[PDB]
Design a protein around this ligand. Structure first.
Ligand SMILES: C/C=C/CC/C=C/CC/C=C/CCCCCCC(=O)OC[C@H](COP(=O)(O)OCCN)OC(=O)CCCCCCC/C=C/C/C=C/CCC
Length: 246
């Protein structure tokens, strides 16, 4: 490999990589404090495990983002802790585009949690999370299909979501701002070259971020309500996952 650069091409190469499943930690879990009825505990636990695998993959991915490992370790941890939930929802929205009814405001009925696994709207309603389910499919999936967001833009936005200089607690915020600025320049360039006829495309893409942030906060409201998230242990899981060993 050559001195790696933070570029769209490199992020596309990284998106396809599949690393040996790193030992995963319990970010999400059905525990003794979870109000999930016995009859739904096995399936909810299975969903948490699917989530934990995707989070493990996210950690491996972040660690390989050009220059990320150069950041102070405690900052790496904060960036991942602050964006894992947004990144999971963003991926769910991206995968869910294919299940949207052909191009009237009938709510989409299927959410793609992973390949070969869809969550039907009725199950979401039954669990009490129909509102957020609809927000994910309308404010993210539908908007992205309408904007024809492509793979290059999707991976650029993922890097931008991760490299958030506004995360509270960072020791060297300027180092994160610089990386996010590198991505803004990369993305703007891509839009101008690959979609020159679409003025304002770059700005349109960035509008999906505040929506994702709002949806993520609502996601946490639910995870805390059902006691499905290992809040106080997460920083440690990331710390351990980063020094690898899994
Ligand atoms: C961020 C995404 C990461 C990946 C997902 C991992 C998180 C956990 C699972 C999320 C799946 C959505 C709900 C589907 C539940 C399936 C089982 C079911 O129907 O339970 C009904 C039960 C009726 O019980 P009962 O109420 O006692 O009895 C009622 C029977 N009528 O309901 C329950 O047991 C409550 C289940 C609580 C699920 C928490 C939602 C997690 C946060 C949402 C994040 C955004 C994702 C959008 C999903 C739509």
């Amino acid at each position: 490999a050559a001195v790696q650069e933070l570029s769209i091409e490199r992020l596309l190469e990284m998106e396809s990589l599949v690393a040996d499943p790193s030992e995963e930690f319990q970010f999400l879990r059905v525990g003794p404090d979870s109000n999930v009825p016995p009859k739904f505990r096995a399936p909810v636990s299975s969903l948490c495990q699917i989530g934990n695998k995707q989070i493990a993959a996210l950690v491996v991915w972040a660690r390989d983002i050009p220059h990320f490992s150069q950041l102070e370790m405690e900052d790496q941890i904060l960036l991942i802790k602050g964006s894992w939930n947004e990144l999971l929802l963003f991926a769910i929205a991206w995968r869910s585009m294919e299940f949207l009814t052909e191009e009237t405001t009938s709510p989409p009925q299927l959410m793609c949690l992973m390949p070969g696994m869809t969550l039907h709207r009725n199950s979401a309603l039954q669990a009490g999370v129909g509102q957020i389910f609809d927000r994910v499919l309308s404010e993210l999936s539908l908007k992205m299909r309408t904007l024809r967001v492509d793979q290059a833009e999707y991976v650029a936005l993922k890097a931008i979501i991760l490299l958030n200089p506004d995360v509270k607690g960072l020791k060297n915020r300027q180092e994160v701002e610089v990386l996010r600025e590198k991505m803004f320049l990369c993305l703007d360039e891509y839009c101008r070259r690959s979609r020159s006829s679409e003025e304002g495309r770059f700005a349109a893409l960035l509008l999906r971020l505040p929506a994702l942030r709002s949806i993520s906060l609502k996601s946490f409201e639910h995870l805390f309500f059902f006691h499905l998230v290992a809040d106080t242990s997460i920083a440690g899981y990331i710390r351990d996952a980063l020094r690898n060993h899994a």
